[PDB]
């Protein structure tokens, strides 16, 4: 599925990614945005041989399974084709996992140098949430 911004949004907010770990709501669909461009079904080749998948690009050297990858750790207990999904629950849950993991959305080096510092209430404009 390819997520428009607010319906992202909206979705995200519904599962409480708003605040999660004090990241507001826009830092969560900027990284989206700059991780799949709001497509659940993004999969992204690491060059460490690990692939990055879904809505926010989660990998799986750490977080999944995906069969291929030298030293899973699986640590969200999902295969990776589960963060593909329509339904972005799977995805959200893991998501918070990472993000408590001590380095806070810095583990998404998309969000880090794409939208940390910027304006990141911009990608909630207009949005009736």
């Known amino acids: 599925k ?7 949004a909206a979705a ?24 799949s461009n709001f497509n659940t079904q993004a ?3 690491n060059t460490d041989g690990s692939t990055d998948y879904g809505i926010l690009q989660i990998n799986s050297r750490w977080w999944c399974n995906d069969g291929r990858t030298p030293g899973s750790r699986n640590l969200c207990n999902i295969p990776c084709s589960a963060l593909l999904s ?5 995805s959200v849950n893991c998501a918070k ?10 583990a ?22």
């Open 2 to 8: 390819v997520f428009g911004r607010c319906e992202l």
């Open 97 to 106: 996992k990472i993000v408590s993991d001590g380095n806070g959305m810095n």
């Open 12 to 35: 995200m907010k519904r599962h409480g990614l708003d605040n999660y770990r004090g990241y507001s709501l826009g830092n969560w669909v900027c990284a989206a945005k700059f991780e």
């Open 86 to 90: 329509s339904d972005i629950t799977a």
């Open 108 to 129: 998404w080096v998309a969000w880090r140098n794409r939208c940390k510092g910027t304006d990141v209430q911009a990608w909630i404009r207009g949005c009736r949430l």
């Open 43 to 45: 999969t992204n080749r």
